[PDB]
């Protein structure tokens, strides 16, 4: 299932939103004092936690402060016709420094497996869930591998989260570095 | 199979989106262009499933489906997806030579996924594959839409297969 759902998020989303990802960072940039950076920062970076219903990204870690938005962007396939989507910018702290600038949005498909899980009558398991995530994820990462305009643009940021000290602000900054 | 899960990102991540401010949107539309739509068959949102990838837009498919307006947008503000503007568009259905429908119609973004799937260069399928998986989008997608009254009301899956659309539309607002 999980397959034609990273395939329809690519398809979907990543394949309008990319192209002018970088033009909008420009604008952004003229427009707060070159914020965005050199290379870590030039990227959308889509976060896909393992371990449903993760923290909102405004709450979630004291180390990941929320500044603004990119200019919106307009779209307008023969969809959908006309479109405005919305992307936000946000601080990463390290050590109580600011350590990192990006652009950072969680996976909607995660929404998407929630819900599937969460129905009553074909509902699965938390650990049969893990395993379509995944799936999800290995899926997507094969799909951008394959197209470097995509690929340069952006990152899957995969992570579990332990029940059992995790930092998502130290994940984030460790893809933005690598 | 991935039509599924495919199905399921269709309802949770559009039609759930979309569906509730529908009426909102219409009243307004009806207001703003003489009750153009109201006759209840006026007011769904039909979505087209051609299982036959890539038909042709709508503006074109069809002398007898004629572009007429666009609904007032829906702004939509989650979090996550902070703000977000969706359109629909209206069209004018004639039969024989003259309007006999109006809605509100469009073709379901999933087809173009289901392509691209059947396209790709390795692990890519035949139409003969990509045909089944369409299939089972279609069943899975009218058994998610059964299972809650509020959005099955205000939308339609119009699915149909080459041996007329316009004629296959009308009798959808017909019935
Ligand atoms: C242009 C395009 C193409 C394919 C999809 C899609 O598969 C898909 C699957 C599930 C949900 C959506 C979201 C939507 O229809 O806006 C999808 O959007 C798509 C869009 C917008
Ligand atoms: C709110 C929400 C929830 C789930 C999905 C989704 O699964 C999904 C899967 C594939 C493609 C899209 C389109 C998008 O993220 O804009 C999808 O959108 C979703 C949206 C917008």
Redesign the interface.
Same mark, same amino acid.
Do not use: C, F
């Given at each position: 299932? =999980?397959? $034609?759902?990273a395939? !329809? %998020? /690519?398809? $979907?989303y990543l394949r309008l939103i990319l192209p002018g990802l970088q033009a909008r960072i420009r604008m952004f940039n003229q427009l707060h004092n070159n914020m965005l950076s050199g290379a870590g920062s030039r990227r959308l970076y889509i976060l896909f936690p393992l371990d449903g219903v993760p923290d909102?990204?405004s709450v979630v870690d004291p180390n990941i402060r929320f500044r603004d938005?990119l200019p919106?962007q307009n779209i307008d396939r =023969? $969809?959908?016709?006309?479109?405005? %989507? !919305?992307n !936000?910018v946000y601080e990463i702290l390290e050590n109580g420094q600011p350590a990192g600038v990006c652009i950072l949005? /969680?996976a909607?498909?995660l929404?998407?497996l929630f819900?599937?899980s969460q129905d009553a009558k074909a509902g699965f398991s938390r650990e049969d869930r893990l395993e379509?995530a995944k799936l999800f994820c290995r899926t997507l990462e094969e799909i951008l591998e394959?197209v470097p305009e995509s690929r340069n643009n952006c990152r899957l940021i995969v992570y579990q989260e332990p029940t059992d000290s995790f930092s998502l602000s130290q994940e984030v900054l460790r893809h933005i570095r690598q």
């Open positions: 299932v =999980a397959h $034609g759902l395939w !329809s %998020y /690519y398809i $979907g909102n990204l938005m919106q =023969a $969809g959908i016709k006309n479109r405005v %989507y !919305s !936000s949005e /969680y909607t498909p929404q998407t819900a599937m379509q394959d």
